[PDB]
Amino acid sequence: AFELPALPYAHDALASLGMSKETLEYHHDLHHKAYVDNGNKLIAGTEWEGKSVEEIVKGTYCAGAVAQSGIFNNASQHWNHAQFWEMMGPGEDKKMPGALEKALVESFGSVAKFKEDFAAAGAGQFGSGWAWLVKDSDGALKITKTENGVNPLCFGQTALLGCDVWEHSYYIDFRNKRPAYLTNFLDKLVNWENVASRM
Amino acid sequence: AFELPALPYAHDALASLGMSKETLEYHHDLHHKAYVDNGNKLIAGTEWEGKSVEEIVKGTYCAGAVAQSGIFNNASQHWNHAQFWEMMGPGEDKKMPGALEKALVESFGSVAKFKEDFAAAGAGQFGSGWAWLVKDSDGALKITKTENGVNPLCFGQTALLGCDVWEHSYYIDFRNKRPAYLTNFLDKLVNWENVASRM
Numbered sequence: 001a002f003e004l005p006a007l008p009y010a011h012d013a014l015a016s017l018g019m020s021k022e023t024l025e026y027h028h029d030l031h032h033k034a035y036v037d038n039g040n041k042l043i044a045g046t047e048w049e050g051k052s053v054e055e056i057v058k059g060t061y062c063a064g065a066v067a068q069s070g071i072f073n074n075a076s077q078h079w080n081h082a083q084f085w086e087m088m089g090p091g092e093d094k095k096m097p098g099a100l101e102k103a104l105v106e107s108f109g110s111v112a113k114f115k116e117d118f119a120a121a122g123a124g125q126f127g128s129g130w131a132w133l134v135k136d137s138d139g140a141l142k143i144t145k146t147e148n149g150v151n152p153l154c155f156g157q158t159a160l161l162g163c164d165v166w167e168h169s170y171y172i173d174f175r176n177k178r179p180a181y182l183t184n185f186l187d188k189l190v191n192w193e194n195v196a197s198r199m
Numbered sequence: 200a201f202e203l204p205a206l207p208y209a210h211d212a213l214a215s216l217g218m219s220k221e222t223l224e225y226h227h228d229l230h231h232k233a234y235v236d237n238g239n240k241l242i243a244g245t246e247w248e249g250k251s252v253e254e255i256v257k258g259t260y261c262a263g264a265v266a267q268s269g270i271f272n273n274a275s276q277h278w279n280h281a282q283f284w285e286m287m288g289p290g291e292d293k294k295m296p297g298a299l300e301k302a303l304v305e306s307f308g309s310v311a312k313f314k315e316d317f318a319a320a321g322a323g324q325f326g327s328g329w330a331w332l333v334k335d336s337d338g339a340l341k342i343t344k345t346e347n348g349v350n351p352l353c354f355g356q357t358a359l360l361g362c363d364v365w366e367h368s369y370y371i372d373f374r375n376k377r378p379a380y381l382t383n384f385l386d387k388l389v390n391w392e393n394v395a396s397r398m
């Protein structure tokens with residue numbers, strides 16, 4: 001069965017970096033929990049019951065549909081949130097590993113440009129979804145955006161970084177200011193070691 | 200040009216019925232404002248500049264696209280929010296006109312059953328969107344749900360009631376509790392006279 005992973009830090013460890021305890025309580029303890037629970041209930045007694053999250057996401061994604069299945073919606077969001085918690089971390093001025101810095105410069109011209117493009121994608125996803133830094137099928141880095149729970153697994157890409165732009169992710173702390181949220185996220189919240197580890 | 204309509208009540212007139220002043224300030228004065236402003240900017244100097252909101256919504260909708268154009272996203276949301284404010288109103292125990300009540304009983308079995316079905320549709324729109332009561336082109340009353348800004352105009356239906364289930368619409372007052380929000384909306388917020396007037 002799907003299980004809700006523990007956060008790798010205390011619920012208040014991101015507060016001084018602009019993501020409140022309250023946000024982490026609702027987002028992790030309630031929203032992510034619901035993806036786990038709803039996922040489990042929909043998967044029970046199906047062909048997907050044995051399988052890994054990744055297999056279920058890839059297997060249930062319908063490229064030709066506006067809305068995805070309940071199984072997909074929950075499995076995809078379970079995976080997304082599991083990555084998201086690990087992609088953030090406490091600590092001022094978290095180190096960006098050399099290998100990642102180099103790869104960002106190579107693909108975007110500069111880290112600054114990468115951050116602008118990432119933030120623009122997040123601002124540009126109309127409604128609920130995610131902005132991503134991915135490694136594409138040619139091994140190049142690029143920015144994508146997706147709706148709802150859709151994610152890079154759906155496209156044979158490797159996620160390096162994801163930012164939740166569903167309003168629940170930021171509304172408590174930023175209200176309607178999704179751009180300020182994205183900027184802050186990139187400046188203060190990202191665990192670049194975790195990002196680098198996915199390359 | 201698009202213009203932001205005034206609310207038909209004071210910003211705090213819904214507070215005792217479960218939609219806070221703060222929600223109306225953010226949702227009306229910032230979110231709806233942005234659809235108006237961004238819509239105007241995107242439409243300026245296009246073939247759509249002359250046209251009514253309704254014509255723009257119907258003309259720019261791309262049947263089957265997951266993501267619609269910027270023009271559509273803003274025009275559709277402008278129309279949606281304009282209906283939404285008029286569909287709510289102050290006053291404890293607002294009354295339902297007979298013609299509407301009869302139509303609902305005929306189509307759903309009871310008003311209670313209608314409300315359950317409406318709430319279920321709103322809960323079931325994964326991500327951002329709207330739940331609706333519509334009169335379709337056959338004259339039948341029925342419940343629909345749509346993503347993001349998509350609405351009944353896109354399907355040749357007449358909207359009787361719409362409820363915003365984008366998280367901004369309820370997160371301040373209900374956090375993650377979208378079902379409690381929907382129940383409260385139907386029990387306390389809906390101006391049934393405005394609903395009836397659309398039939």
Ligand SMILES: [Ca+2]
Pocket residue numbers: 092093187
């Ligand atoms: Ca720094």
Ligand SMILES: [Fe+3]
Pocket residue numbers: 027031081164166168169
């Ligand atoms: Fe989320």
Ligand SMILES: [Fe+3]
Pocket residue numbers: 226230280363365367368
């Ligand atoms: Fe809204």
